[PDB]
Subunit: 423 residues, 4 copies
């Protein structure tokens, strides 16, 4: 007699778990953590309020969190990402899931509500919308929270905003910038997928072409290397002298966007800033110049300055518009300045383990370890995330000998690197 | 008319000054740091006791410190490294330099001590490269040691010595780890792990690595550089690790993580870059196939238990410089490079650009700790501030004619950042 | 007033001409070849029968031929590829074009035949892309076929068809293999094997290859490109080969050469790029581990015996476009892409620069064979002359603003070479 | 009672063969060819006159050639390269070896003599000095020769000179440009070793530096890729439009040497030409610019124009001179314009097998297969060279199935590629 949930369940729980069964086969790292951490119950009594994508992979995390003794009350962090069939499966398992595909902005806040009120220990968030809603609607529930586990870039920025500015009164965990997760998201975004959206939408070869990549951070470094590999001539713009010196040494020219704006075939933004590519820059670009945002939002390129009456827009294909100037000049604008963009199950597994361990760490943390500030996942916990993914490669880790562990000032299991280690 | 110096240099100043003049054209980033902060004398009142190599490059650092108001008393960190000519030009310039080429072990500790004690001289700062001068001030003059405003250390073992006193509470003075400061760290990594990583190995071997099987022990800065270099030449690289993060990094970089024994009998090359002792033991050396190459790109000479190969049944043949063939009674030989030591310690010298990065880091690390308020640094080892790291990088940008973009008021408002202030958070790995 | 054309285009010429005008800015190398050889009309008297895609790029080639004095009669090599608008502008320009989008198999052979026979028209040259027009002239009009001055073929199967007649003595006319001409070959290799090699695979899969085990069957142009691309992402790549040179190349590039069976049960991805039949047989598909990906980057759809997977005990589920999950009775599924066909044939189009290289090669291959003296080419298939290959490359250099160095009389005397003549020997692989 | 030889043998034959025994262990590809081709005796009666380096590796080829039924009369192609101890070992084995270290230019031609006259079938050469000596001293012995097997660049050029110009009246084998050998020499020279001499002698890092590589052939492509990998900014000069287009597409600028001569930190020649870097170029180079020849001879850079009285030479280290101009400007000249430069035993094994099979092919060739021209080693013979080196990697070659070999128009063992194949 299941009541505590809100999904559009049509006996979908039988099919829903069958798609989770496939996901469980693909994320054997969490099932190992489930098996290894079982019995001990490190989340015994934990009342977790979650807000993330309701997918078959996520179910493996929620069903793992609940298997380690936690009370799961959940919501969807997006109004279209909910895999209703898996959501309906979670409802039958006992998980208080309030989520469906095609929910409105009112249904969205309604689900976050039914998730909070009906003594919530912890909050697992992806976005920070649930965290901010508990910050302006239930502040006495908020001050009693043991820890906020955040995986989103903006959500974590919102937490760093509260901190130091005198507002954060609860210890937080930045899992986005945590070592094992950051490094793995870097490999997927900046190494593997970096030019997939750009190659998919353009049908030109980058060999022998001139490109300008704005920003030489994670995305910029990844982008330039991939473009360099293809035989493209790449130029870089930077505000950070460390990143600029890094570009110089990597055989790239560090320029001001205007020095190359008139000759480059392709313009790429990956800064996280606004008005990097302005009206003046789009006016100086040579005809057919590809304009691409590989950073955030749609403010990196001032696309709003191209809606004026003299310019005309012609839709070439999906996610490709031609913005034509009265002199006949056209720029190939990809996805209206938005990031072109399903995350691989192995990437989610890395994130899910980091999130799971971040909850176990903050929940069982002593009163004096974590102050009212944002923190990264402990080094030994970061090592545990990596270790749980090693059997997927049949990787044989070496154990330190008693004299070896005595030589280097460290424990046979303990943190192997200093705090400032960059990997 | 001054006699406050000890050099062999019998009017070698004129010639030596020309070498500093030549060096100053290559240390253009230090001359800028000199020019930009002079007249404001940020080291006015600093009494610095130094122990580093005396070269025409180092001399530019010593003189930038003297130009920023500091009063220097210098020593050599090595008994062979001293370029006497520059030591003269410095002594003639007024710097209290106490060094020459061809020192004995007793002369080495005489000079170090000459820096520490003098009538009316009390040291503010210690700039070391090795830690030997620091261990000397710590044990010979503990009362002077407690009164030092800050230690700036270059060396790996010297910094680890400083980190050891911390967590043991023997460190009563703040320390600056320049070795792991971003700009300096990233630059050494590029020199050591990217550009030079196979130089020593290629120089001493005369085989091609393409098509070969190599086992690299450790996947840290050196291991990563090494494996990339070997991957690019066509070598099949196997990795051993104790750290599951570094091992997962290797799995994701296309390498298999194995226990040393799983491949020891099939690899053509064995490389150690751990910083550990007995990574390759007698057991491993015995199981290696004939013509296997054994190399240490890590620390000291204890990564491979070379002393276990000094048994009467084994026969040593130096076939080339730094190359020994250790032949077993059954005829099997292992090609052992530099007797288990790092090869680069007996091959070449550090590029002036790498020296420029380091010297700039050192000068700013001394300017920081000296002018630092209390409570900003306690009795611990710290890394160079981000705005200082950025400045080290910025001073080296004109040599590439780099054009840095400056944030607009609207742009710098969007990010919670200063137009010229720190651009990255503390946990930024770059 | 002419009616010598068959197009659907009801005054579509004005619009279509604008597309050729747009294309001519991207085919700048052909406009130069046009401009440089015009007035000298090297194709004056050539009666060319063509069968290629009708696009605004191809139209620039057809018009360069008509501008060099040639008289053209064109057909489409595909029943879907025709851009009708350009077909109008060409018909209006005077070219005898016989093509439109949405042809039936019977319409396709009607147009091909319309090109071949006409009152007072006898073909000098055949420009094909597929070989279907060549097989048609060879069997329907053998008397016209023996009188053709030269065949210039673009396609892989068309060229192999031409190479088959040779050594069998059925080829009575000289043929130009543009597919394996240096400039064209090196350019396709860069597009197909370097730039696009994993595009189809990345588009249809949603997994990361870094850390995965991949077996690539064949280490030719495609296999080499593929393995490099996979090596760079962090994948562990295994190679299978029949050719010991290509296998030794893989051994030297850091890959293990294995028999397909040695790794079939452990690989995450299987790739075929051989050009052979039954490289991956039912036995292999049965031994693949659950979630294995099967991809064909070779020819047709016979490299993987997909027809052996159409048994009643196997269940097919199209999870995405061009992605089928073939599930066994025990639950094990294999992710099979494009039903064993090449993915690129249903994803994108060929870059205009690649088209420019090819079109330039084709025009010069027709200028060569038409103006070629007898005894220079016999009843065999030949590659484009070196000085012509150099010219194809030279015509594309200004788009990069390349500055070619010219040999001095002393320099060109030192090497047995002409200042502008052939620069490399015949066996030069580049 | 050994007489037919000329070495400085002091019972060195006992130690000599012990160094060959080590070499035999390292080139098991030739011992396999020795074993496989034994019994058949494809060189039965062959009277080979050889001129190459007398090393422990070479001994394995000579002792293999003689093991396949050939009569070995040998000389040294260089006056300093002879490993006397191995030469003395060959003398005892029955090989007519006339060679020693430190022989004069008169001793050199004397040894080539005692090698020819005492009915020589074949000639195996490395240089073409022995081939030219049989061309101007014994022309009736020369016209009776079945084939010339040449491995040297200049020696092969000398043969291509005779051919077409109406002088070559004997079929030749170009083993230098033969597929398996060319590709393997390319890997050693242009991939593995390309920057070893330059890195060894300079002590600067190439990251962030500007380089000019003159020529984009085998050496140029190899050099630029290695420099590109290190983060250097590389520019290229070319005379060949195919090679120039190749550079463009590889993300390099194709320039005239003068456009970059004043800004580049490093100048590299790999053209095979003379006066690429002239007096005018060395006068425009910025102070400390490294000048390096990676091509041929010492004529690529006009070093002879820097001996004039206004310039001064200062020897920095071994193979590094500073050429100082009166204005104080200095250029770092490496090895007086000469190539900086022991070849690995696996490379020699590839060459030795190609040479061995080139001799078996031309000796047993029918009268009508090879005319009076220079040829490359047959494709199936090239495949045999590669196959014999595969067990060193434990490489498992796939055998074509009867229907597979029927599908592609080829034999289960025959040439797998067309003649124009570039690999
Ligand atoms: N493309 C993707 O797959 C993807 C994925 C996740 C996030 N992002 C977003 O992309 C942006 C960049 O991500 P990152 O991880 O590379 O960040 P990062 O902080 O590592 O790098 C951003 C870089 O841009 C530089 N920069 C900032 N303003 C600039 C300016 N206006 N002109 C030139 N350079 C400037 C910064 O100094 C920094 O080096 C962020 O907003 C990030 O959230 C992109
Ligand atoms: N080769 C060079 O040019 C060079 C230069 C400077 C310093 N070093 C020295 O080399 C050592 C390594 O340098 P690094 O920069 O790589 O340091 P690092 O800490 O970044 O890397 C050391 C790695 O070795 C691994 N490791 C430790 N014990 C192991 C074991 N026994 N088996 C397998 N792996 C093991 C660790 O997990 C770590 O990742 C240090 O002592 C350093 O001082 C070498
Ligand atoms: N992927 C693409 O974009 C693309 C593009 C054009 C053509 N192709 C086609 O793909 C096929 C291969 O192209 P290529 O350019 O690599 O040709 P290629 O001849 O250069 O390479 C084929 C390789 O496959 C090897 N091989 C043959 N049978 C084998 C076997 N059964 N097992 C293992 N290896 C085997 C051969 O030794 C040869 O090296 C051709 O039919 C070609 O038309 C693919
Ligand atoms: N560095 C080494 O390890 C090494 C080894 C063997 C031989 N070589 C010699 O080096 C030279 C180059 O060898 P390769 O195999 O690269 O030859 P290659 O024929 O493959 O390339 C030479 C290139 O230089 C270009 N070129 C010729 N003259 C030029 C000019 N004056 N200006 C600019 N470019 C010019 C040619 O077009 C050609 O592309 C040859 O003499 C060769 O014998 C060098």
């Amino acid at each position: 007699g299941s009541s505590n949930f809100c999904v559009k369940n049509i006996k979908q729980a039988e099919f829903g778990r069958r798609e989770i069964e496939i996901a469980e086969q693909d994320m054997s790292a969490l099932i190992s953590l489930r098996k290894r951490a079982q019995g001990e119950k490190p989340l015994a009594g934990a009342k977790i309020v979650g807000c993330t994508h309701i997918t078959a992979q996520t179910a493996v995390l929620i069903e793992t969190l609940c298997a380690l003794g936690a009370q799961c009350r959940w919501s969807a962090c997006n109004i279209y990402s909910t895999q209703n069939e898996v959501a309906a499966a979670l409802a039958e398992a006992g998980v208080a899931v309030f989520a469906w595909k095609g929910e409105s902005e009112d249904d969205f806040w309604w689900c976050i509500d039914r998730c909070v009120n009906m003594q919530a220990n912890m909050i697992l968030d992806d976005g920070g919308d649930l965290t901010h809603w508990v910050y302006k609607k239930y502040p006495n529930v908020f001050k009693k929270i043991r820890g906020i586990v955040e995986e989103s870039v903006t959500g974590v920025h919102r937490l760093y905003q509260l901190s130091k500015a005198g507002k954060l009164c609860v210890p937080a965990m930045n899992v986005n910038d945590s070592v094992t997760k950051q490094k793995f998201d870097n490999l997927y975004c900046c190494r593997e997928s970096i030019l997939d959206g750009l190659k998919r939408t353009t049908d030109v070869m980058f060999g022998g072409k001139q490109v300008v990549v704005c920003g030489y951070g994670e995305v910029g470094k990844g982008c330039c290397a991939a473009l360099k590999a293809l035989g493209a001539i790449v130029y870089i713009t930077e505000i950070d002298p460390i990143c600029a010196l890094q570009a110089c040494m990597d055989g790239f020219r560090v320029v001001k966007l205007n020095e190359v704006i008139r000759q480059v075939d392709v313009v790429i933004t990956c800064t996280g800033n606004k008005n990097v590519v302005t009206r003046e820059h789009l006016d100086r670009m040579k005809n057919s110049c590809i304009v691409c945002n590989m950073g955030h939002s749609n403010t990196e390129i001032d696309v709003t300055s191209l809606r004026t009456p003299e310019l005309t827009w012609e839709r070439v294909r999906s996610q490709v518009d031609h913005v034509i100037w009265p002199d006949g000049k056209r720029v190939v604008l990809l996805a209206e300045g938005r990031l072109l963009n399903t995350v691989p199950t192995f990437v989610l597994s890395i994130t899910a383990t980091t999130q799971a361990l971040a909850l176990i760490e903050l929940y069982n943390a002593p009163e004096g370890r974590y102050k009212q500030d944002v923190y990264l996942l402990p080094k030994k916990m970061d090592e545990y995330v990596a270790s749980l993914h090693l059997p997927s490669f049949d990787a044989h880790l070496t154990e330190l000998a008693d004299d070896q562990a005595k030589y280097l000032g460290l424990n046979k299991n303990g943190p192997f690197k200093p705090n400032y280690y960059r990997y």
